[PDB]
Design a protein around this ligand. Structure first.
Ligand SMILES: [Mg+2]
Ligand SMILES: [Mg+2]
Ligand SMILES: [Mg+2]
Ligand SMILES: [Mg+2]
Ligand SMILES: [Mg+2]
Ligand SMILES: [Mg+2]
Ligand SMILES: [Mg+2]
Ligand SMILES: [Mg+2]
Ligand SMILES: [Mg+2]
Ligand SMILES: [Mg+2]
Ligand SMILES: [Mg+2]
Ligand SMILES: [Mg+2]
Ligand SMILES: [Mg+2]
Ligand SMILES: [Mg+2]
Ligand SMILES: [Mg+2]
Ligand SMILES: [Mg+2]
Length: 49
RNA sequence: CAAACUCCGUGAUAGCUGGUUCUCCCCGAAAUGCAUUUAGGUGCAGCGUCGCAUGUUUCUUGCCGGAGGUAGAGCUACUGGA
């Protein structure tokens, strides 16, 4: 018997989103951008070497 | 006031400064080279990580084959110098 409550997503379909910057517990204070730098502020184009 | 004030383009633009919030488990860097209107930025390769693949090809020692050209030494051997 299938009720609307027993539905199960398949193992591995649901990968949790990565909420960058939410405490030193997981991703803290720099959001995986390292310390100061251009990538630390906005970005650099796809082109300029 | 070395270009008045209010509104608007306007979230002007900031390679600069600050800040970036709940827990645990696993691995774990560099401050190097090259290039750069580049030197406090950035990209490539090394350095980490995760996955896949080759599953030891890697490591240590012993022995073997090797080329050096340093320490030292030498100079009636040269270049110098006494
Ligand atoms: Mg900071
Ligand atoms: Mg720095
Ligand atoms: Mg950086
Ligand atoms: Mg006025
Ligand atoms: Mg407007
Ligand atoms: Mg505009
Ligand atoms: Mg602004
Ligand atoms: Mg900007
Ligand atoms: Mg500061
Ligand atoms: Mg460790
Ligand atoms: Mg083997
Ligand atoms: Mg030998
Ligand atoms: Mg020999
Ligand atoms: Mg000597
Ligand atoms: Mg002698
Ligand atoms: Mg001579």
């Amino acid at each position: 018997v299938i009720k609307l409550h027993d539905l199960k997503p398949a193992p591995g379909e649901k990968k949790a989103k990565t909420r960058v910057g939410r405490g030193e517990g997981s991703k803290g204070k720099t959001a995986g951008r390292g310390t100061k730098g251009t990538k630390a502020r906005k970005n650099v184009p796809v082109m300029f070497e």
